[PDB]
């Protein structure tokens, strides 16, 4: 009679949380983070005339 | 084997959530064309402008009133605006009709001003509406910006300040837009009474002024969150590995024989003392007389 | 400095517990059968 | 020979659906629900002049 | 009145089925070994 | 049985990501009303072309 | 202009004029903006954001 040997199970995921949050065409927070600093990027909002 | 108590910690994936207030004025400019038998709005230019922190801390948090004259900066020029194109006043801040729990807002004007004129001419009006809203702010790692319930991204860390090395956080703004008031006593616009003193940051964004009570980064954000406290675990000593068997959860975790130094992980100051308190409570309530610590 | 990334399932750990339990019990019983034989 | 005892397995989740929908900076539906009643909140859209 | 919240995994219930099956079968076989012995 | 080598393939749920460039001009038209002691912007028509 | 998201523009200023007290004056800006963006398309790949 032979004994069962030890096994170790690995945490296998088919898709990660990032992959599951990468299936849409646009991300609202990404667009808003990039576009709400348009005036900071392309203008000088601290100089007064 | 080795019996003991364990606290399991998972990674914190949620955003850091706090509360702030937004102070801004709604500046609408309506242009009507009075015609033969009708009036036609030919333009309506709405704009949100900030309330400067001098005005806040000297009129709103002093008397609960807001000036009827907007003074701001557009196109690098110091522009103004007057409600109904009249002499400026200080109007009282009145609660919205929808002031349910949490999301509250106090404004001064329910009306929007416009004029038509004699048939054949254009006439221009102007509104100004002081609006103070309690919003829910929200920041995610690495906490160098926060978004508001109004939809606005504030390109400054929620922990930017002037003391405690906080001035070394991230900020996409000039240091002239940022104000900190140590010991500031906010005013509750409903009970008309000052709140308790607390350091308060103010930032004048081109379209609004954000104000939030300052709190240090070390005590508010944390990379790890408690998943499960386990009262009875068993640590085994398999070849090259530890094993943590938890018969109440029916879960077996497999570590290495080495300890993990939580100093390699960002923002891990919570775990040590939180787990110490939880484990001490569990021990004192369950294993006070049966076992002893090791 | 780094950050810890946690999976979204502890099904593997329940599998580990169940296999460990069945394996330990069956091994004890097999050992007993062998000694008695 | 001893028998295996009964076990009951608990539905363990590491993160709930709410926790998994709480990782972003802004929620489009939340912003839209809060901001599309600005005119209802701060103006009287039923009175005529 | 309340609402029912359902988990996003029935892996625990498949684990329960598998453990129940293995446990019942192994217990029947152990009982038989004991009676014959 | 049959020994061998295998490669497991899952469905690709991610979006196809590339890089592009956008070329546009920001055309702002500001109308001010110079008053007695102040200037008031009465219109500002921004447009991307 | 950090890594990846870069943008080149021509004007940091926005033009407006006030005039003599009692009149309207109209200005105009034009800002050439070239941005490197990240495009993104999902099946069946007949559009990209």
Automatic annotation (TrEMBL), chain B:
<protein>
    <submittedName>
        <fullName>ORF31</fullName>
    </submittedName>
</protein>
<feature type="domain" description="Herpesvirus Glycoprotein B PH-like">
    <location>
        <begin position="12"/>
        <end position="222"/>
    </location>
</feature>
<feature type="domain" description="Herpesvirus Glycoprotein B PH-like">
    <location>
        <begin position="224"/>
        <end position="294"/>
    </location>
</feature>
């Amino acid at each position: 009679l032979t004994l069962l040997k030890d096994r170790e199970f690995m945490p296998l995921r088919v898709y990660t949380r990032d992959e599951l949050r990468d299936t849409g065409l646009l991300d609202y927070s990404e667009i808003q983070r990039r576009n709400q600093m348009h005036s900071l990027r392309f203008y000088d909002i601290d100089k007064v005339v | 084997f080795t019996e003991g108590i364990a606290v399991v910690y998972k990674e914190n994936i949620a955003a850091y959530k706090f509360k702030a207030t937004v102070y801004y004025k709604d500046v609408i400019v309506s242009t009507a064309w009075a015609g033969s038998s009708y009036t036609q709005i030919t333009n309506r230019y709405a704009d949100r402008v900030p309330i400067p922190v001098s005005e806040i801390t000297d009129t709103i948090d002093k008397f609960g009133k807001c000036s009827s004259k907007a003074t701001y900066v557009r196109n690098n020029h110091k522009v103004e605006a007057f409600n109904e194109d009249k002499n400026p006043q200080d109007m009282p801040l009145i609660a919205s009709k929808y002031n349910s729990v949490g999301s509250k807002a106090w404004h001064t004007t329910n009306d929007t001003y416009m004029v038509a004129g004699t048939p054949g001419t254009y006439r221009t009006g102007t509104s100004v509406n002081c609006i103070i809203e309690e919003v829910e702010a929200r920041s995610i790692f690495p906490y160098d910006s926060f978004g508001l319930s109004t939809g606005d991204i504030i390109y400054m860390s929620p922990f930017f300040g002037l003391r405690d090395g906080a001035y070394r956080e991230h900020s996409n703004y000039a240091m002239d837009r940022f104000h900190q008031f140590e010991g500031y006593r906010q005013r509750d616009l409903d009970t008309r009474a000052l709140l308790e003193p607390a350091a308060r940051n103010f930032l004048v964004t081109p379209h609004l002024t954000v104000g939030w009570n300052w709190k240090p980064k070390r005590t508010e954000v944390c990379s790890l969150v408690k998943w499960r406290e386990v009262e009875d675990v068993v640590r085994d000593e398999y070849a090259h590995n530890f094993r943590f068997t938890m018969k109440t959860l029916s879960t077996t975790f497999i570590s290495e024989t080495n300890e993990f130094n939580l100093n390699q992980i960002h923002l891990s100051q919570c775990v040590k003392e939180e787990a110490r308190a939880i484990i001490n409570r569990i021990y004192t309530t369950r294993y006070n007389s049966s076992h002893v610590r090791t | 400095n780094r950050t810890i990334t946690t999976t979204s399932s502890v099904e593997f750990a329940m599998l580990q517990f169940t296999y460990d339990h069945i394996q330990e019990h069956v091994n004890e019983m097999l050992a007993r059968i062998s000694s008695s034989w």
